[PDB]
Amino acid sequence: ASTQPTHSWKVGDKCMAVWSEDGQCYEAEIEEIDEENGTAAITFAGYGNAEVTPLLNLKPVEEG
């Protein structure tokens, strides 16, 4: 990776992402990870949106 993140995430995993629109964390599933920037593309579960948010902004979920 270009930058090495302390947060270790993989594709197919859901995390909680901070919705850039509301500033809160919602369950979002990681679609793709960009290790170059340390950012991941996530899809908000239920709502069905997707944003590229840094791994640092990804939080661990409960029950998964």
Ligand X SMILES: C/N=C(\NC)NCCC[C@H](N)C(=O)O
**Residues forming the site for ligand X (CB under 6 A):** 19, 26, 44, 47, 49
Tell me whether residue 1 or residue 56 sits nearer to ligand X (CB atom). Answer: 56
Tell me whether residue 1 or residue 60 sits nearer to ligand X (CB atom). Answer: 60
Q: How far is the CB of 20 from ligand X (least distance, A)?
A: 9
- CA neighbours within 13 Å on the CB side: how many for 5? 19
Q: Which residue blocks in the chain are alpha helix, DSSP H?
A: none
Burial of 64 (0-12, 13-18, 19+ CB in 10 A): exposed
Q: How far is the CB of 5 from ligand X (least distance, A)?
A: 22
Q: How far is the CB of 59 from ligand X (least distance, A)?
A: 13
Question: Beta-carbon neighbour count of residue 46 at 10 Å?
Answer: 9
